[PDB]
Amino acid sequence: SHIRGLMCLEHEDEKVNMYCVTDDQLICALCKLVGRHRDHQVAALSE
């Protein structure tokens, strides 16, 4: 059983990675690699 999670919207076989503070919208690694969220701002490790 595994019908829970906060993966990407377009990427079903890819779980999120962090939160883009610039655009203010959660994203994944595939977005930071395929998309344009590579030079954007994020937050690693919940303070």
User: Could you tell me which residues are annotated as the binding site for Zn(2+)?
Assistant: 8, 11, 31, 37
The one-letter code for the residue type at 3 is: I
Q: Does 37 bind Zn ion (CB under 5 A)?
A: yes
Q: Does 32 bind Zn ion (CB under 5 A)?
A: no
Q: Does 18 bind Zn ion (CB under 5 A)?
A: no
CB contact at 8 A, 6 and 21: no
Characterize the bridge pairing of strands 16-20 and 25-28.
antiparallel
Q: Does 17 bind Zn ion (CB under 5 A)?
A: no
> Is the Cα dihedral 33, 40, 23, 26 positive or negative?
positive
State the residues that interact with Zn ion by CB under 5 A: 8, 11, 20, 23, 28, 30-31, 37, 40
